[PDB]
Write a protein that holds these residues in place. Sequence first.
Motif, mmCIF file in Angstrom:
data_model
loop_
_atom_site.group_PDB
_atom_site.id
_atom_site.type_symbol
_atom_site.label_atom_id
_atom_site.label_comp_id
_atom_site.label_asym_id
_atom_site.label_seq_id
_atom_site.Cartn_x
_atom_site.Cartn_y
_atom_site.Cartn_z
ATOM 1 N N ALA A 1 0.829 -1.187 0.000
ATOM 2 C CA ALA A 1 0.000 0.000 0.000
ATOM 3 C C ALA A 1 0.878 1.257 0.000
ATOM 4 C CB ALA A 1 -0.945 -0.047 1.198
ATOM 5 N N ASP A 2 0.237 2.426 -0.081
ATOM 6 C CA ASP A 2 0.917 3.725 -0.071
ATOM 7 C C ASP A 2 1.146 4.145 1.379
ATOM 8 O OD1 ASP A 2 1.760 6.393 -0.263
ATOM 9 O OD2 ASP A 2 -0.196 7.134 -0.899
ATOM 10 N N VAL B 1 -5.496 -5.521 4.879
ATOM 11 C CA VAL B 1 -6.266 -4.324 5.196
ATOM 12 C C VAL B 1 -6.441 -4.333 6.710
ATOM 13 C CG1 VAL B 1 -8.421 -3.061 4.892
ATOM 14 C CG2 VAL B 1 -7.465 -4.388 2.969
ATOM 15 N N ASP B 2 -5.734 -3.449 7.399
ATOM 16 C CA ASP B 2 -5.810 -3.346 8.847
ATOM 17 C C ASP B 2 -6.838 -2.293 9.228
ATOM 18 O OD1 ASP B 2 -3.926 -5.263 9.069
ATOM 19 O OD2 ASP B 2 -2.269 -3.906 9.565
ATOM 20 N N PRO B 3 -7.348 -2.338 10.461
ATOM 21 C CA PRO B 3 -8.414 -1.409 10.844
ATOM 22 C C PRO B 3 -7.932 -0.128 11.496
ATOM 23 C CG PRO B 3 -8.217 -3.093 12.495
ATOM 24 C CD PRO B 3 -7.174 -3.410 11.454
ATOM 25 N N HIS B 4 -6.670 0.234 11.366
ATOM 26 C CA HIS B 4 -6.227 1.525 11.859
ATOM 27 C C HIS B 4 -6.005 2.403 10.635
ATOM 28 C CE1 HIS B 4 -2.634 -1.139 11.589
ATOM 29 N NE2 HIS B 4 -2.199 -0.126 10.863
ATOM 30 N N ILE B 5 -6.466 3.647 10.719
ATOM 31 C CA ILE B 5 -6.564 4.536 9.568
ATOM 32 C C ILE B 5 -5.627 5.720 9.798
ATOM 33 C CG2 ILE B 5 -8.146 5.912 8.140
ATOM 34 C CD1 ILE B 5 -8.678 2.795 8.191
ATOM 35 N N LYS B 6 -4.669 5.914 8.886
ATOM 36 C CA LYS B 6 -3.690 6.987 9.040
ATOM 37 C C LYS B 6 -4.363 8.349 9.144
ATOM 38 C CE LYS B 6 0.209 9.349 6.887
ATOM 39 N NZ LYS B 6 1.221 8.961 7.884
ATOM 40 N N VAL B 7 -3.988 9.108 10.170
ATOM 41 C CA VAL B 7 -4.469 10.476 10.330
ATOM 42 C C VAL B 7 -3.772 11.334 9.275
ATOM 43 C CG1 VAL B 7 -4.620 12.455 11.861
ATOM 44 C CG2 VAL B 7 -4.983 10.141 12.762
ATOM 45 N N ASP B 8 -4.516 11.710 8.238
ATOM 46 C CA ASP B 8 -3.919 12.281 7.036
ATOM 47 C C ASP B 8 -5.041 12.945 6.249
ATOM 48 O OD1 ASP B 8 -2.767 12.836 4.541
ATOM 49 O OD2 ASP B 8 -2.495 10.735 4.002
ATOM 50 N N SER B 9 -5.022 14.274 6.185
ATOM 51 C CA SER B 9 -6.106 14.976 5.515
ATOM 52 C C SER B 9 -6.183 14.670 4.022
ATOM 53 C CB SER B 9 -5.956 16.475 5.747
ATOM 54 O OG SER B 9 -4.802 16.959 5.104
ATOM 55 N N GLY B 10 -5.147 14.083 3.430
ATOM 56 C CA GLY B 10 -5.205 13.657 2.045
ATOM 57 C C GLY B 10 -5.655 12.228 1.826
ATOM 58 N N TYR B 11 -5.988 11.513 2.898
ATOM 59 C CA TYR B 11 -6.386 10.108 2.841
ATOM 60 C C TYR B 11 -7.917 10.083 2.857
ATOM 61 C CZ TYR B 11 -6.474 5.069 4.178
ATOM 62 O OH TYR B 11 -6.688 3.706 4.215
ATOM 63 N N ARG B 12 -8.518 9.714 1.718
ATOM 64 C CA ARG B 12 -9.969 9.833 1.563
ATOM 65 C C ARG B 12 -10.706 8.998 2.610
ATOM 66 N NH1 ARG B 12 -10.448 13.991 -0.091
ATOM 67 N NH2 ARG B 12 -11.966 14.340 1.603
ATOM 68 N N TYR C 1 -10.307 9.321 18.865
ATOM 69 C CA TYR C 1 -9.131 8.698 19.451
ATOM 70 C C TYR C 1 -8.019 8.580 18.416
ATOM 71 C CZ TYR C 1 -6.058 5.288 21.658
ATOM 72 O OH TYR C 1 -4.967 4.641 22.183
ATOM 73 N N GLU C 2 -6.800 8.914 18.826
ATOM 74 C CA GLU C 2 -5.621 8.806 17.974
ATOM 75 C C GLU C 2 -4.540 8.039 18.718
ATOM 76 O OE1 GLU C 2 -4.379 12.622 16.628
ATOM 77 O OE2 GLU C 2 -6.134 12.972 15.334
ATOM 78 N N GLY C 3 -4.066 6.953 18.115
ATOM 79 C CA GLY C 3 -2.927 6.217 18.626
ATOM 80 C C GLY C 3 -1.827 6.120 17.594
ATOM 81 N N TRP C 4 -0.845 5.253 17.822
ATOM 82 C CA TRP C 4 0.259 5.051 16.893
ATOM 83 C C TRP C 4 0.235 3.620 16.370
ATOM 84 C CZ3 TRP C 4 2.640 9.568 15.831
ATOM 85 C CH2 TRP C 4 3.755 9.554 14.988
ATOM 86 N N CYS C 5 0.367 3.458 15.052
ATOM 87 C CA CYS C 5 0.531 2.120 14.489
ATOM 88 C C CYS C 5 1.440 2.168 13.263
ATOM 89 C CB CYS C 5 -0.828 1.503 14.161
ATOM 90 S SG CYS C 5 -0.886 -0.320 14.254
ATOM 91 N N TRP C 6 1.284 1.227 12.331
ATOM 92 C CA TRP C 6 2.165 1.202 11.164
ATOM 93 C C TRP C 6 2.267 2.528 10.406
ATOM 94 C CZ3 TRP C 6 5.063 -2.201 12.577
ATOM 95 C CH2 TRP C 6 4.715 -3.528 12.837
ATOM 96 N N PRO C 7 1.187 3.291 10.162
ATOM 97 C CA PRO C 7 1.366 4.539 9.409
ATOM 98 C C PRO C 7 1.709 5.717 10.296
ATOM 99 C CG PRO C 7 -0.967 3.921 9.519
ATOM 100 C CD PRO C 7 -0.231 3.050 10.485
ATOM 101 N N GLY C 8 2.174 5.452 11.505
ATOM 102 C CA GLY C 8 2.342 6.528 12.466
ATOM 103 C C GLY C 8 1.022 6.808 13.150
ATOM 104 N N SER C 9 0.693 8.084 13.305
ATOM 105 C CA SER C 9 -0.515 8.457 14.025
ATOM 106 C C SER C 9 -1.759 7.978 13.269
ATOM 107 C CB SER C 9 -0.544 9.968 14.238
ATOM 108 O OG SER C 9 -1.698 10.354 14.960
ATOM 109 N N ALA C 10 -2.666 7.291 13.979
ATOM 110 C CA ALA C 10 -3.803 6.625 13.350
ATOM 111 C C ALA C 10 -5.032 6.695 14.246
ATOM 112 C CB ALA C 10 -3.506 5.154 13.033
ATOM 113 N N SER C 11 -6.201 6.683 13.608
ATOM 114 C CA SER C 11 -7.476 6.581 14.304
ATOM 115 C C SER C 11 -8.124 5.227 14.039
ATOM 116 C CB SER C 11 -8.425 7.709 13.903
ATOM 117 O OG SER C 11 -8.053 8.903 14.555
ATOM 118 N N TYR C 12 -9.079 4.887 14.892
ATOM 119 C CA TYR C 12 -9.641 3.540 14.930
ATOM 120 C C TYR C 12 -11.132 3.598 14.649
ATOM 121 C CZ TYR C 12 -5.112 2.090 16.503
ATOM 122 O OH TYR C 12 -3.762 1.818 16.559
#
Lengths: 87, 854
Positions: B343-344, B377-388, B408-419
Amino acid sequence: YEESKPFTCLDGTATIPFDQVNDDYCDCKDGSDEPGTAACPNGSFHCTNTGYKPLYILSSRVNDGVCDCCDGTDEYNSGTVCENTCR
Amino acid sequence: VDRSNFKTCDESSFCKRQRSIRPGLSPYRALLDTLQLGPDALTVHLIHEVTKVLLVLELQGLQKDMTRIRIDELEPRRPRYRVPDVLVADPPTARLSVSGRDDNSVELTVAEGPYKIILTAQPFRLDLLEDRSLLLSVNARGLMAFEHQRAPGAWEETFKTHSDSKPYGPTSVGLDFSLPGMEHVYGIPEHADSLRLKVTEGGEPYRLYNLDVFQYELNNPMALYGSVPVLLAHSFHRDLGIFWLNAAETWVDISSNTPQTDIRWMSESGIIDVFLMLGPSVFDVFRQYASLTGTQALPPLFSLGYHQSRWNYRDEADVLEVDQGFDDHNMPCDVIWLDIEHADGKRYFTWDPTRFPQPLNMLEHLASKRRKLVAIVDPHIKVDSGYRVHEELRNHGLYVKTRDGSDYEGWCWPGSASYPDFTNPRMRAWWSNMFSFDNYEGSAPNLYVWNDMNEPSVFNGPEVTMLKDAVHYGGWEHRDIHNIYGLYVHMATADGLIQRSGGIERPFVLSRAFFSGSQRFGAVWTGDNTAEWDHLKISIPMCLSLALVGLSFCGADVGGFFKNPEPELLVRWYQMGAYQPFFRAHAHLDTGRREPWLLASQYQDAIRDALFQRYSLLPFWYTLFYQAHKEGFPVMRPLWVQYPEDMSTFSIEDQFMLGDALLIHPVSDAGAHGVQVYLPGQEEVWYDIQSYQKHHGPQTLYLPVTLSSIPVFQRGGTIVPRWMRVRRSSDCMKDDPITLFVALSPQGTAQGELFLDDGHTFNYQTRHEFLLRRFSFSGSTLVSSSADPKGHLETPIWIERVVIMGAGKPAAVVLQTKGSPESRLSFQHDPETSVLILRKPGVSVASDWSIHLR
Ligand SMILES: [N-]=[N+]=Nc1ccc(NCCCCN[C@H]2C[C@](O)(CO)[C@@H](O)[C@H](O)[C@H]2O)c([N+](=O)[O-])c1
Ligand SMILES: [Ca+2]
Ligand SMILES: [Ca+2]
């Protein structure tokens, strides 16, 4: 009236009638009785492939639905129609 | 593993409170004046003698010899959590009757017997009987504990640097169960521990809390990635099961004591909700539990083949080189896997624009080899205003929230992520719609999905997971729902693969976290194991404990995830995995490449032999999974499931059965020269499927082995169907003829089944397009009949061969099938091995036929 002769495996392990040649069951331990089917585990299928190099493939790839010969003759009853690509 | 990150029971304040209550006189008592026998249940008030807190017991007899016990507060300040979406139906009830009553006791009869429940008033206690046999007691040691909700480490609590605000205070519930006659208990996965569960008295309880444990170690009760709160008890005389329906953090104590095992469950919140499954046989328990939480989803055929994976395949060119490597080395393989580097920048549902620029064409080249692909496809979503994906979930308020209302914001593979809040049905529907071919651009019908890290893993969170006081749909806390979060991910993903097809295609989803009911949604695996001999050994007891609780589609990473296996260990792991339900090789990012053709020829050949044996047994595997799907019976089984009266099998875990027909003892020691194989059963015979040598049970046979040995035995009295024409993938094989292997009992009988359908759709269910055949041998006749007449299927599959073990040489072989003249078949017979081979019956598998040996 005179009749016909039988078939002998190339390894010499047996002699069988010619109606068991390409009858979709493996009767020779070297696979020589099924050159046109997928029945023998150790058999080979000959791609003539005019317009390119001729090639041998494993018997297991005859009518597996995958195009292996560029001339497409390995798929004659599998639902996959192969096009000639020997160019 | 660094154990300091994970709480012991002492560091868990509710576990410490509960576990400090020791066996003794319970302060709870039932107010028999309040007893009411309702239309489907019995209700009666309970009271704590000191606190005067009032609880309500809802006691229910259920159809299929089950009892359900539920305890809640009489007047709670706020409602307690009751686990949704796990039960497939409202369980049908059976009527209770009062059949006895005194000052301190009420006897209740379920329907018209033989099951009875004795409610004692002081101290509160329940006994369950079949006639006059006591099966099970509840609260016999007085360990019942129900912390009522008080006025909003008992409250605010810190672990390491994380503070649980704990706005509702202590709310934990606990309850004990006594199993007279039982000395062996099993289940409550997941633990890297033995099949037979150990007593916990001198140590930690077994913990049930879906957690991501880095480089987890063997033989300890730490909670791993999934939690199934189901415990099975087996003795010579009976089988019982306990299903503790709670989604919060749960600890389980087990104690032995005339032989008797006591079980105590301890959970952080929710209600008490437990199912007692009375057997009497273990298959009765399977059926009872299946009626509550469902059965194993019928896997699409391809997913029972061989999966080739690692972290990570480089690019499209790499995937295609791997694909071509299998064909160039004559090795079968159905699926190649794409881990997070495809993935990107770990933005799921995307493709790296350099290394995976044309996914449709990559998928098309795999489709032309009739192979599939799996994308993670993991269930943590990168906090990124360009990520649709992130923008849509944020804009629609579908994220897990903190108490102050922010996402909620934690840290995972893409760095800061929401659940995403997968407990929210609106979120699950959004997720499922995201798998449509228009939304998941680049996906195609031969792309399937892997859900990982769905405990959820949170790298900077307490115990590497989400804060207990995060807030979900309907105001419930994360402590309430934790253990079903992964299941909801697995469920939303699986439904998405169904919906994107218009409801026609069966899904395939591998999930790391799981709960009761996860069997309905696909497969699981034991997570990040290690390339070591002992990790190879432990795959059997781990997947067996998952099989016993309904999760039949289980496996472990072949070769081990961490570290580099020596070639001999890799060979033995291929042979082991080749006979386990979920069969995938996987590897860590820093391991050397270990595609099976990269080894020296002697190792390549043994691996190829193991792959061929797996592909040949697909009709058998497929039928076992259809029986799992229809009946709830596990595919991989402990020997004691098939031999419940042989007490020497109660702990075996270096051996297992597939259905009732095959016994497997893989070599799991470096440089081994033989194995000790226990062949059970009185008057039972077993056939070495490599040499055809017959052995009588019961015995422990010493069997010499080489690098290529996979010790497998077929039970007399069984018929195993095989595809002897191994091709490059299962799609290539699914119209090929069947060879039947008949293992004759000492009475000259055998039986077996076979399931067939198109291999991937729900047509077997919506159009009854399938075949269920029964094959049976007795006297001197092999007969094929329909085991389900509702099933019809257009198929070219025929019977090309019958191999009968334990037969004498006949004088003639005669085939009869409806619509055809009586035929004579030629045959070959070996007098040394008593193996009879019938040449080319040539009959359709959809036709009734019979073969007579004269
Ligand atoms: N806390 N801190 N942050 C951390 C946490 C962990 C960590 N490495 C742990 C390796 C376990 C990953 N295993 C899962 C993920 C996959 O590896 C890739 O999706 C997949 O292949 C596998 O199957 C899955 O089970 C590192 N680190 O790499 O330094 C930093
Ligand atoms: Ca032949
Ligand atoms: Ca082909």
